[PDB]
């Protein structure tokens with residue numbers, strides 16, 4: 001539909017496989033995206049896509065709500081735990097931000113820090129997919 | 143016990159964390175290895191460790207049985223499907239070889255080819271751990 005998918009998912013492979021898809025509605029596009037993401041792209045592609053995002057607490061818009069409500073204290077712990085999380089899991093903390101505060105997200109990060117690396121990899125994959133779905137609606141609603 | 147663990151697991155992190163472990167029996171060492179492998183090292187470390195191995199059908203000893211029973215035909219499909227598997231999953235096909243034939247392993251590879259990349263990542267992690275356990279016994283039995 002438009003290889004501007006590298007923006008709608010930092011995964012080159014996902015963008016590629018989507019670029020060559022027989023155009024469909026805004027609904028079928030969602031379903032075809034999830035199947036490719038969850039069953040076709042490999043772990044390496046998931047990692048590329050995660051890296052494309054700014055950490056939670058930095059800027060590069062899903063974070064508008066969090067910034068319209070942030071605090072130096074939240075931005076502080078955040079900048080610190082992001083470092084801790086990257087060291088432990090190998091990729092940055094991924095979460096679909098939106099109506100979320102930096103405080104709630106800092107808490108979700110601390111919480112998730114205690115997961116096994118393999119499980120954090122599944123949760124991030126899911127959070128990434130939600131972000132992608134969110135951005136696809138923005139392309140089809142327009 | 144001896145940072146020669148990079149040989150007993152291509153993971154630098156796993157080797158590191160093990161190098162600084164209060165010496166224990168051949169049994170406690172196994173259990174401490176599994177916990178570190180499954181709950182401490184990240185996906186990136188799993189990937190480093192997989193890469194350290196020769197593909198099934200190539201040489202760099204767990205493969206002695208398979209070579210004492212191989213065939214040009216098995217070595218052929220193998221060399222081909224290994225390429226296909228790497229393309230799809232992002233890492234080579236990992237399996238504890240031993241009393242296994244290239245034929246049985248070629249079949250396990252074709253079978254596993256139909257798994258979701260995330261699941262192949264778990265199976266490889268487990269196969270890798272079995273290989274590691276196998277090699278640790280060889281260090282403590284000596």
Ligand SMILES: NC(=O)N[C@H]1NC(=O)NC1=O
Pocket residue numbers: 053054055056062063092093094095096097098131
């Ligand atoms: N850190 C992190 O997950 N950032 C991503 N999440 C989101 O909603 N937008 C992003 O860029």
Ligand SMILES: NC(=O)N[C@H]1NC(=O)NC1=O
Pocket residue numbers: 195196197198204205234235236237238239240273
């Ligand atoms: N391909 C692959 O898993 N090779 C590994 N397995 C094993 O038993 N020894 C290896 O080096």
